[PDB]
Every structure is written in structure tokens, then in C-alpha cells.
Design an enzyme around this catalytic site. Sequence first.
Site, PDB file in Angstrom:
ATOM      1  N   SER B 161       0.839  -1.243   0.000  1.00 25.86           N
ATOM      2  CA  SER B 161       0.000   0.000   0.000  1.00 25.86           C
ATOM      3  C   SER B 161       0.858   1.272   0.000  1.00 25.86           C
ATOM      4  O   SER B 161       1.450   1.584  -1.025  1.00 25.86           O
ATOM      5  CB  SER B 161      -1.319   0.015   0.800  1.00 25.86           C
ATOM      6  OG  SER B 161      -1.377  -0.306   2.193  1.00 25.86           O
ATOM      7  N   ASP B 256     -10.013  -4.835  -3.799  1.00 31.11           N
ATOM      8  CA  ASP B 256      -9.122  -3.806  -3.226  1.00 31.11           C
ATOM      9  C   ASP B 256      -9.473  -2.505  -3.922  1.00 31.11           C
ATOM     10  O   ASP B 256      -9.364  -2.396  -5.137  1.00 31.11           O
ATOM     11  CB  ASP B 256      -7.677  -4.296  -3.321  1.00 31.11           C
ATOM     12  CG  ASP B 256      -6.582  -3.265  -3.094  1.00 31.11           C
ATOM     13  OD1 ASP B 256      -6.832  -2.274  -2.364  1.00 31.11           O
ATOM     14  OD2 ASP B 256      -5.477  -3.465  -3.685  1.00 31.11           O
ATOM     15  N   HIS B 286      -7.309  -6.271  -0.017  1.00 29.32           N
ATOM     16  CA  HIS B 286      -6.177  -5.437   0.473  1.00 29.32           C
ATOM     17  C   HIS B 286      -5.732  -5.957   1.842  1.00 29.32           C
ATOM     18  O   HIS B 286      -6.608  -6.272   2.648  1.00 29.32           O
ATOM     19  CB  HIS B 286      -6.609  -3.982   0.584  1.00 29.32           C
ATOM     20  CG  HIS B 286      -5.456  -3.078   0.738  1.00 29.32           C
ATOM     21  ND1 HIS B 286      -4.748  -2.627  -0.349  1.00 29.32           N
ATOM     22  CD2 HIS B 286      -4.877  -2.554   1.843  1.00 29.32           C
ATOM     23  CE1 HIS B 286      -3.793  -1.831   0.066  1.00 29.32           C
ATOM     24  NE2 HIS B 286      -3.834  -1.781   1.423  1.00 29.32           N
TER      25      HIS B 286
END
Lengths: 315, 315
Positions: B161, B256, B286
Amino acid sequence: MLLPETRNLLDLMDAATRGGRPGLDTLPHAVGRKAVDKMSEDGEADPPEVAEVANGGFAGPASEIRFRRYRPLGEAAGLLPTLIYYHGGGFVIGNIETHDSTCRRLANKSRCQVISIDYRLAPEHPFPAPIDDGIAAFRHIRDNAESFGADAARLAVGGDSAGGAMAAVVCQACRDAGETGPAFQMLIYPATDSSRESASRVAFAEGYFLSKAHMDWFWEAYVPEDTDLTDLRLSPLLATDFTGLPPAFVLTAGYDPLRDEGRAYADRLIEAGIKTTYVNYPGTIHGFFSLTRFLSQGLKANDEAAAVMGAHFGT
Amino acid sequence: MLLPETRNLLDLMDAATRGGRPGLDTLPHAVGRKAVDKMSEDGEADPPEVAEVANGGFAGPASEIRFRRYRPLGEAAGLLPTLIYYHGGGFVIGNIETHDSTCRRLANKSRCQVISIDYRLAPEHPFPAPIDDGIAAFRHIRDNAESFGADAARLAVGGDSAGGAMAAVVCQACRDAGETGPAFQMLIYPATDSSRESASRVAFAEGYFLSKAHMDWFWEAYVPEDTDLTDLRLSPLLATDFTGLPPAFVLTAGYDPLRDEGRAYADRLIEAGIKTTYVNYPGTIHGFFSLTRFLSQGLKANDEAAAVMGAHFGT
Ligand SMILES: *[P@@](=O)(CCCCCC)Oc1cccnc1-c1ncccc1O
Ligand SMILES: *[P@@](=O)(CCCCCC)Oc1cccnc1-c1ncccc1O
């Protein structure tokens, strides 16, 4: 653009053309095959040691299908995860001996067994004979897994160019007929569309090893005169539905007529919710996966292919 | 659609919400951090043994940057290929301890050294502080390779991320300033565009672990009020030129918010002629790359990422 090692090999090939090497597209199919088969053997890197190589045959649909099993170094288990590998050569040239080094290496790096298949070639056996054997081979090994030291749960298909096409058709055939397909598909610069010329097919038609001349010469031999070019066994990219196809690894080269159709197939699988790895090797040509005596990128490619498949099967 | 293991975890999380667990977006940043940091630690699979863990610090741009080196099992060589790894948490939460299990595993499977970096977090140190450290860390390790047991030729960056965003900005920063960038970039479901909401950002804004509420809460803390959202340090996808960026591996999850911007970045690299692997893990969320106590797909993902990087560096 082109890697130095790719430019050097295309230059050596051009030197041999000016030197007086005949064009493959100028020879008859049987004579050209013998000639190119020795050049292919000599283009692969020196074959690594494996645990064990087995040579045998089984009853095909309409002839004997020969195979070679490769057991990797360090893997003592009875039933191994297995890749059924279909060599390339436009359904006309190539055989088990031409892709031997590549298969040994895939086996060792993946920690999987590799089973190389010797399908019928054109023009002696035109379309749809080579695909019929590839499908017959998958079914024979699926339904006799233990005979082949294969784990039926983790039984994969793959190949390069025409072999890539074959692997993709085997999954579509198994899905469409409602039977148990492979658990994974490894497509090395596959041929997925005969109905259209993409940007890559037009752009790289001359001077990038695989030429239009070569592809017409294979086509002359492979295809009976009046066939629907949009038949899913010739053009698996034109499939209507991509759901229920096995997880896929797809590889393309930058200077490969087949790049665009290779990547299109990958896109179709990704959007249909199939777990999918896609890799582009820019600056190298069609064939580099087995031209590993001259092209270092080919060895790195075998390792990426092997590594991804080992990660999926937890080897 | 969703894998059973993903559905089970989202159900346990929903059970804890109805149970009376507060929302992360309801707590102040410092209090929520301490709380989620313990939950992250406990969501990673049991940490494997490595050859050696080193803990140390060095002079950052405006504070001390802490790091942890992981030497993999079986690698005796002095200078190893090295991945500099930037943890995730929206530049607000996460640290070396939260991504420890993942890092140990990457190290072992890749045959590479991993160096986890402890960069400054918001809100205490808002934009552009966390990126300034990430860049400072790469330069410190590049220019002191031997101190860190790193082979300068084979020095990679990566992250997940916000760490993925950071890795991508480090390569763009090194390219734009004319200096020697990383030799490889590993982007695990990165954040590449703040200027726009994609189809995935809208579609998966609720009920898939990473929600809009979470992303606004990180944004509140990370970004000073009036910043150009199209700044390349916030939105590296909007870069004008992708040539001269290192070979990339890029990973996305199906559910995600960040999937579409993750895949867009991959597309930009592929079209620019950068060697590039793209993989989609459909049916998972995610965070799955480090939620490996509950999500088996996370372990398979670590292995695919490790394997691809090992293949590139020839480990
Ligand atoms: P492939 O089977 C390409 C044919 C696709 C068109 C479908 C009818 O050809 C290969 C594959 C691997 C290695 N080599 C070659 C090859 N070598 C020398 C000359 C031609 C070809 O195709
Ligand atoms: P990442 O840093 C997502 C933030 C992208 C937006 C940029 C400002 O969040 C991660 C990454 C890895 C593991 N966990 C998390 C996470 N966990 C719990 C709650 C929220 C998040 O983002």
C-alpha cells in the site's frame, strides 16, 4: 529498444543468410524440419542434470504418442506436481529433443515433474490432428496420474508458440466438454488468434527471427484449404466465456509478432476473475525461451516461469 | 467471487464490529495506531527462522531512521542482493514489528537480504516527511552498500500500500534527479493516484477491510490542507515519462479499492518498454499479503513475489 544480445543474434543469422543458408520457407516441409531440428537442438543451453529422465509411449487417438518425464533434483516424494509441456514449431517442426534443455531446467527450478509430449505434426497429419493428441495426452495422464508419478490435484499444461496455443485449447476443450481440466496453464508467447493481424504481427513481420514467410509456410502445412479461421481450436482468443479456466502464467517478447494476441489472452483471463501472472520481456524476440545458448534473458525467463508455478503448487 | 477464507475473515471482523469493537476512523491517530499495531502483529503467520537479524539506525534527513536486516537461510556470501522494504499503513500506522513475519519469509524464499525501514509517520510528521525518509534510506544504503552487506548492482526497493507508493516514488525521484535508482521495484497493491476515484475505489469503498472511512482517516493525518493532489509524490501514476524506471513486479487483490490504479501503473510500465510482471489475486482483499495467519493466499503471494525477484537477481 533491442538488447545487445538480441541484436548480436539477429546479426549472426543475417550473416548466415548472406553466407548462403537457405530460407526455411524455400525448402519442402520434411527436409526443412530435419534441418531446423538440428539448429534448434544447438540453440538451447547445455542440458542440466535432473534426478531421472523416463522415455515411453501410450495409445493415442490414431497413433502412438511418445513422452519424456523429467524428475527434478532433490524431490524424493512419489507423486509430484506435474507440468505437461507441448513444444513449439507451428505444428510442423520441433520435437522432445529440441526442448530438452528447457524442460530439464523448468523441472529443477519449479521443483515439479515435467512431461514433454510428442504430438503428430503437419503436413503428414494436418489440423485438427496435433490438438487431438495434446488433448488425448492430458486425458491419458489425468486418468492414469499414478502411472506417471503425477499428483492429479496439481496437474498443469503449458507450451511455447504452437505448444502455447495447444495448452490454451486443452483448457478450453476440458471446460466446454464439462470434464476436469488442468490446475494451471503456462503460456510462453502463445498463438491465440488466426482470424486477425494485430499491430505486432504487422510491425514485426520481417527481420525478427519469426517472420510472415515462416508463418505462411507453417500455415500451408497445418491448415486444410477451407477452414473457419474463427474456430476456437485455431483462435482460442475468440472464446465467448473465460470463466472456469485454470490459473494462468503468460509470457511475451517485445519483438514477437504474437505479443499483442499473447497479452489480449492475458487481459481476457484477468477480467474474467482468473488468478493470472502476466510478464513482458521487452528487447528480445520470439524463441528466446529456448535460444538460451545465445540469449541470457531466456534463462531468466525459464526461472520466472518455473518460480511462479512452484509458488502456485507450494513446491 | 470471494474465496471462502476471505469471506470467513470479513465475517469475524463484522462480528467484532457488532460485538462493540470501535471503528479505527472514530479514534484519535496515536490511540488507533497502538491498537491496530497489535492486531497487525497478530494477523501475520508465525515468523520463520532466518540466518541472522540485525537491528540498527542511521542519520535521516531530520531524525534517526531505524532498520532491520534479514539474512536468509543457506546464503553464505558476504554481499547479498538486497530488497529495501517499506511497510504499509497509509503513512500513519505500521512499523518494522508489524511486517516481521512477511519480511523473514520474503528473505528465505527469494534467497535475498531484506532491509525493513522505519520511516517517520503522520500526523506527527505529515507529507512530505515519510517519502523524504524512504528516499534518504535508499541513498544511504546505495552509497554505503558494503556496510549493509548489500551488492550495489542488485539493490531493489518494494513495499505494500503506502510502502508500495513509497517504492514507486523512490524510483521516479532517482530517475528525475539523474542518479542511480534501484535495480528492481516490487509493488504490493500500491497507492499510485490521489487525483481520481477509479471503478474499484467506488465499488469496494465499503465492506472489504480497507474502506473509504479508513482512507479519509489516513488522509486527514498524511496531507496538509492545500496540496496539489496531482503532485507526483502523491500520484506517481500521473508521471509524464515511465522510461528509465527499473524492472517491476506489481500485485493486486480483486476486492481492493486500489486494484485499478495498481493495474494502470503496471500498464504504463509495460507500454514504456520496462520488463514487468503483473499478477492479480482475485477473491481476496487489500492487506492479505500480511494477514497470513487467516489468509493462505497471502503465503502463496509472498512466495510468488520472492520467486520473481530471485529469478531476476539469479539467486
Ligand atoms: P512457434 O510454434 C510459432 C508458430 C505460431 C503460428 C501458429 C501456426 O515457433 C517456434 C517456437 C519455439 C522455438 N522456435 C520456433 C520457431 N523456430 C524457427 C523457425 C520458426 C519457428 O516458429
Ligand atoms: P496501506 O498503507 C493503504 C493506504 C493507501 C492510501 C494512501 C494514503 O494500508 C495497509 C497496508 C498493509 C496492511 N494493512 C493496512 C491497513 N490495515 C488496517 C487498516 C487500514 C490499513 O490501510
